Amino acid sequence: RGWFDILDDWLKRDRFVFVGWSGILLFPCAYLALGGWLTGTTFVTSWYTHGLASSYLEGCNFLTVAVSTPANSMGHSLLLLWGPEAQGDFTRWCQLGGLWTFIALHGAFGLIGFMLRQFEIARLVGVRPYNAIAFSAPIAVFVSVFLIYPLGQSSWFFAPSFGVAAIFRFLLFFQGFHNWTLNPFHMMGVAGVLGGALLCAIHGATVENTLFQDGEGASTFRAFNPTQAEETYSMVTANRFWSQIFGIAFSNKRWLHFFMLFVPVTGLWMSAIGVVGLALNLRSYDFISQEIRAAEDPEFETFYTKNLLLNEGIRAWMAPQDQPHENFVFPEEVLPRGNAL
Amino acid sequence: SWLATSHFVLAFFFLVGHLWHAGRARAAAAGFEKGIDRESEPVLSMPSLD
């Protein structure tokens, strides 16, 4: 019983919020990132990195605030406060996008720390680490988008910024520049997320409407004490409901809840593979067979070529403002415009 | 626009509230809105499908 055993006792001490060994890596870094988001969305401008207002101090609201990305000239500079770009100066460091890399790296380390926490708590409470395995899908989304995608691009500037409207920029960026809707790896993510939200809603309402009557009150939530070892709902009725409504039903409650683990986690892992491809601009932008068809036939219109016309709209109308470093000076006549608009 | 959208928000929820209360009041008049009785569960008394 030396100091590692004694520090193991106090870290794994049974308290309100469990600290653990991961809390040395989680609890500062998850708090510096979230504390640095709120510091950047309240007090830090994007007037030199982007030419934008993005704090509450400037006039932005919660939708329009962001901790914006560094400038493109920074490249993939780590932008340490002590590093060669900030040179120690905190006032300069916030202006150069240093708080974006502060959040994207402490938030990276806190997400390791939360995923390690999920391992550490499951090792102490004696359960399987499937919540850590299911947390691999938010890791891979945070890693591909906030870290791997800018690392594949020219700088941190093209990463998403930590803000509500700035994410909305990033969604509309990927439609115009990457055609990310058309990418098959994003569709597996939409099928995984909406499948998850469906399996959340279906399994939630199936259990809640196949409950056993265990209490004599009309509000059923007090008919459950947790130390009981009965099924609180009728999985037999639930299987017979969905077998005749939908055609197929789960009959294994363990396979049902693995499928609930499987479906959003495989979806968010598939979206990761697409964004890693989009880091290198490996888009499913175009079906080559159709733009061969549409470039020598001016009457073949599909909704696909309509979306590509929209992306040319996004890429030329947004970019002189979205990408100020490029000095895109697009005249009032190079802009792709339909009739009358 | 204010009147159509507010009375669409309200009219949809009032369809949901109809589906809530019509399902419940027919479950209440038949006697299983609080749950399924375990001793007399209908599906274990109902035949198999395939």
């Binding site: 037999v236 299987n239 077998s243 055609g247 197929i248 039903a249 009959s251 | 274990l44 198999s48 499908l49 395939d50």
Partner: peptide, 29 residues
């Protein structure tokens, strides 16, 4: 070659027909 490949969908309907009516049934156990 294009459309008749895509018409993979006819295998899905046959799987939709088989997994509904010819599934190994749930057994009360």
């Amino acid at each position: 070659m294009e459309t008749i490949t895509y018409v993979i969908f006819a295998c899905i309907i046959a799987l939709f027909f088989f997994a509904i009516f010819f599934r190994e049934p749930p057994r009360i156990t």
